[PDB]
Amino acid sequence: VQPTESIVRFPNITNLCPFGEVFNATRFASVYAWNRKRISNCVADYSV
């Protein structure tokens, strides 16, 4: 038997993922001291 409709469940998460503090950053780091920032617990937009 075939499925009837598709359901997608994502959480609410009332914040956009802050890629603006890692992409639009005035001081990018160096390669011996590369800045690592974990981004989590949000809804991300990869279309931009």
Partner: antibody, heavy 118, light 107 residues
Framework: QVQLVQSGSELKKPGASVKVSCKAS????????MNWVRQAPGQGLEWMGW????????TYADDFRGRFVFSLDTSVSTAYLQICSLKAEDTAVYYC????????????WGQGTLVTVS | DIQMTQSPSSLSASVGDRVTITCRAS??????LHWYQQKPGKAPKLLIY???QSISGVPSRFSGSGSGTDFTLTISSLQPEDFATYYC?????????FGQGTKLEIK
């Protein structure tokens, strides 16, 4: 002696196109960039973008992506900005700023271009 | 996009006292928050760069401190002739936004 002299107080129609000047002297002009901020008298400083000394690409800010145009004329030490299609909400001064690519603090120096529109 | 607020809006102080003004951040400006002041009818001048260091050639009656999202400078010896509107400036994320200002006033 390092200083950044400016143009005078401009007064034009809402829709004219005026070009303000920022003449530099004293330092290595190709070394540090030519940042520009705006300040309404009831508000604070707002950065509008900059332009590199060697290529001339006018990279604006995230808000003022439109009618602001930076114009470069090298080997005479000028940092010309031009505003076109002026609006009545742009009653603000336009401060020029020598500002480097790495340190990114200003030491902004402009005597005040009183761009009054009515 | 980065909302840079600072409190109190209008606080008064007297001659020779010690005052503390803050600058509260919404997002992370972890080290890059600079300090300016603006006299009326005057192009501004640096006070504290990189939130701890002081520029050479300023009167050192004040020092800046703080990290994270809370930043301050403390005027250890206040003088009446300033009447300056203190300005915040972050150097971390584009666009470079500023603060509204803490106007210092005499009683």
């Amino acid at each position: 002696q390092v200083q950044l002299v400016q143009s005078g107080s401009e007064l034009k129609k809402p829709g004219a196109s005026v070009k303000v000047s920022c003449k530099a002297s004293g330092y290595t002009f190709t070394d540090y960039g030519m940042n520009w901020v705006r300040q309404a008298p009831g508000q604070g400083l707002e950065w509008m973008g900059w332009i590199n000394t060697y290529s001339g690409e006018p990279t604006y800010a995230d808000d003022f992506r439109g009618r602001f145009v930076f114009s470069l004329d090298t080997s005479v030490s000028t940092a010309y900005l031009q505003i076109c299609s002026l609006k009545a909400e742009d009653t603000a001064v336009y401060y020029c700023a020598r500002g480097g690519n790495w340190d990114w603090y200003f030491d902004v120096w402009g005597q005040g271009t009183l761009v009054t529109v009515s | 996009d980065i909302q840079m607020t600072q409190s109190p809006s209008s606080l008064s102080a007297s001659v020779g006292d010690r005052v503390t003004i803050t600058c509260r951040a919404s997002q992370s400006v972890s080290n890059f928050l600079h300090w300016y002041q603006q006299k009326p009818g005057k192009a501004p001048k640096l006070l504290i760069y990189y939130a701890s260091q002081s520029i050479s050639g300023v009167p050192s009656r004040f020092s800046g401190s703080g990290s994270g999202t809370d930043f301050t400078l403390t005027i250890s010896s206040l003088q009446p002739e300033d009447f300056a509107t203190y300005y915040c400036q972050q150097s971390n994320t584009w666009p470079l936004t500023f603060g509204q200002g803490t106007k210092l006033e005499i009683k």
